[PDB]
Structure formats: structure tokens, C-alpha cells
Paper text:
To elucidate the structural basis leading to substrate recognition and the catalytic mechanism of [name], we solved the structures of [name] complexed with various sugar donors, including the ternary complex [name]/[name]-Glc/PO43- (1.95 Å) and two binary complexes, [name]/[name]-GlcNAc (1.88 Å) and [name]/[name]-GalNAc (1.64 Å). The active site of [name] is present in a narrow cleft formed by the face-to-face apposition of the NTD and CTD, with [name]-sugar bound to the CTD and PO43- bound to the NTD. To reveal the structural mechanism that underlies the sugar donor promiscuity of [name], models of [name] in complex with other [name]-sugars, including [name]/[name]-Gal, [name]/[name]-Xyl and [name]/[name]-Rha, were further constructed by docking based on the crystal structure of [name]/[name]-Glc/PO43-. [name]/[name]-Glc/SeP, a ternary complex model that represents the reaction state, was constructed by docking based on the structure of [name]/[name]-Glc/PO43-. SeP was shown to bind in a narrow pocket near [name]-Glc, consisting of a series of hydrophilic residues (N20, H58, R61, T83, T85, and R155), which stabilize SeP in the pocket by forming abundant hydrogen bonds. Prior structural results indicated that K158 can form a weak hydrogen bond with the β-phosphate of [name] at 3.2 Å, potentially impacting its ability to abstract protons and hampering its likelihood of acting as a catalytic base. However, a nearly complete loss of catalytic activity was observed for the K158A mutant, suggesting that the hydrogen bond on K158’s proton abstraction has a subtle influence and underscoring the significance of K158 for the enzymatic activity of [name]. Moreover, in the [name]/[name]-Glc/PO43- complex structure, K158 forms a stable water-mediated bridge with PO43-, a phenomenon also observed between SeP and K258 in SelA6. Thus, the Se-P bond cleavage mediated by K158 in [name] may begin with the amino side chain of K158, which captures a proton from a water molecule. The resulting negatively charged water molecules attack the partially positively charged phosphorus atom in the Se–P bond, leading to bond disruption and the formation of a selenosugar product.
A specific SEN biosynthetic pathway was identified in [name] DSM 30034, which is recognized as a way to incorporate Se into organic matter in bacteria. The bacterial SEN biosynthesis gene cluster encodes three proteins, SenA, [name], and SenC. [name] catalyzes the generation of the key intermediate selenoglucose product using SeP synthesized by selenophosphate synthetase (named SelD or SenC)15. In contrast to other types of GTs, [name] performs dual functions in two-step catalytic reactions, catalyzing the formation of C–Se glycosidic bonds and the subsequent cleavage of Se-P bonds to generate the final product.
Numbering used by the authors: 3 to 328
Amino acid sequence: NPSLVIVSPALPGANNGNWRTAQRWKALLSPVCSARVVQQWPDADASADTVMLALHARRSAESIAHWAHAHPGRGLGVVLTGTDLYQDIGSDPQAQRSLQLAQRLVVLQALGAEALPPECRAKARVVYQSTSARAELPKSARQLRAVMVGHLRQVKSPQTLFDAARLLCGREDIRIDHIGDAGDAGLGELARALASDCPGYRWLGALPHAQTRQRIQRAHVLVHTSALEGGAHVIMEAVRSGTPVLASRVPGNVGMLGNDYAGYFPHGDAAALAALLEACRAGQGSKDRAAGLLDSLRTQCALRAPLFDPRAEQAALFQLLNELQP
Ligand SMILES: O=c1ccn([C@@H]2O[C@H](COP(=O)(O)OP(=O)(O)O[C@H]3O[C@H](CO)[C@@H](O)[C@H](O)[C@H]3O)[C@@H](O)[C@H]2O)c(=O)[nH]1
């Protein structure tokens, strides 16, 4: 059986996407190979590795190079997690070199290969991520509770959420919970000042993943404003909890929710987001109502939900492994 090494830049045990992906892939591939996760390669155990899957064409570029030089033409998959595909590979030589050296390039939703140079598309492979489902909860019509989840950095465009919450500062019937570490400098100060001014907006800080999944499950709607995504875990998690999504219309989000999804706003457009939230609120009512925006979005998200089934991610990873060690 193959001996797979997964390279993740994330600090071990970190509560973020890069660590989550590596540990989940390890678990899904364990029945057909010996799999391990490292932050860099090689290490003492490198001689027995036969396949490498490396997350982020730039952050892992050094381990990717080490593998490519030790195993030219063989065994290397490079996973495009987001800022590499939608930023770095434009002009970062390290990210560009990882694209050339790889035997396969993994993108995390169907649109990802459009951002690759055309000479890299033949070796590109789509692997939708997966997450465990949660029962869809019945929810009250008395208030609209929205949540957004993302450690604060500029690529998450949290200012769109700040500005839309400000536009709704007077609305007692709408609540916005914001989950995520302070991160990029100054953004935490913006969240704190906004929560002090507008009681409907709460910045909860970073929360353990278990509690975050529960809050996504409880919310009426998840908002995601990012300038770019590889394929966001939190959108998956909402969809697989029966919670519909309002998302910025950028390729990483569109690949997750579908070209026909009715819950997009243009990136950076806080008034558009605020108006979608108002429409979600306006549509709320009793079991004897019909045809609210939230209900149309729930119907659409339910059609997306099978994309994020772990048995499906596993089968695609099995195929990927077979291609990297035939
Ligand atoms: O306070 C917090 C903040 C985050 N999360 C979790 O963090 C995870 C990962 O978040 P995600 O939405 O995927 O964002 P990133 O961490 O930025 O992940 C990056 O990398 C992933 C691949 O590893 C891609 O799928 C994403 O698009 C890309 O943004 C999710 O499971 C969240 O529930 C928490 O539990 N608590």
C-alpha cells in the first residue's frame, strides 16, 4: 500500500481550514494507505513516503520542491487552497514553480481550474470537500439570526459585514454573530467598536469548532463576504446543517453554491448584503406562511448538500491516490 505524506502549513491542531483538510484527508485515506501529516518535508521518516499531497502552492513550496527534486515526475499533488490560486500564482515565482512541478493539481470546487493557466488544466483534479451533516433545526420567526465565521484577515473582507451591520444598527429584529480570531491588525478593533455601538452585532472571538458548528446550525443564515476562497469549510458546514447562505459572488463561493444560486451579493457591496438580510427577515413567518427568501435558499442549499458527503470526497481521493501511485 502507498505511504502518503500530507504537507499542511497550518500549526498542528490549529482550528482552521488547512489543518482541517489535512486531518480529514488523512482519516479518509487511512483504509487504503499509511497516511501522515507534517508541516514540512523531508523529515526522519521521508524515505518511506511514496506520494505527497501538499497544501498551498506558495506556503508549502519548499517541501513541494524537495519532493519534486527527490521524485521528479512522480507522486506529487499540490492542493490549491485559495490565496495561491486566486492571488499568488499571478506573480509569485514559488507558487508558479509548484504548479509546474506537480503531477496533479487539486482544486476544491468546479470553477478552480478556470484560474489556472491553460497549460496546467489537463492535470487539474476537482475534489469537493466534505463535512458531517447536522439535523436541520426548526427555527423561530421572531428574529433573524445571522452568523459569519472566519478568522479576521483582509481576504475574508469582514468590512463588508461590518458595514452591512452598521446599516442595520437600528434593527432590533436582526442579529449578526461574528465568529473568528482577531488576526489581521485593526480588523478586531473595527469589530469591537461596532459591537459597542450596535447591540445586534456581536463579535464572539474565536470559538472551538464544536461550538462553531452548533452556532451555524442554530443560525437562520450564514453570511460569507470573502474576496476569495478555495472552497470554504463554513459554507459546507452551513449547507450540511440546513442553514442557507448569503455569499459574495466570487468564484470560490460560486463553485460551492452553484451558478443559479439566489443568495449572492457583489463582492464589497454592503448595501446589497444588508438588503438581502432585510429580505430574509421580511420573509420570516409561521408554519402557515410561504415563499420567503430563506425558504428558496434552503431549497437550493439542500440540492448542493450531497456535494459535501465524506464518502464522495473519499472516493475522489481514492482516484487521486491511484493516479499518483498507479
Ligand atoms: O473561530 C473559528 C473560526 C473558524 N472555525 C472553523 O475553521 C474551519 C476552516 O475555515 P474555512 O471557512 O475553510 O476558511 P480558512 O481557514 O480560511 O480555509 C482556507 O483553506 C481551506 C482549505 O484548507 C479552504 O477550503 C478555504 O476556502 C480557505 O479559505 C471551519 O471548519 C470553521 O468552522 C472555527 O471553528 N472557529
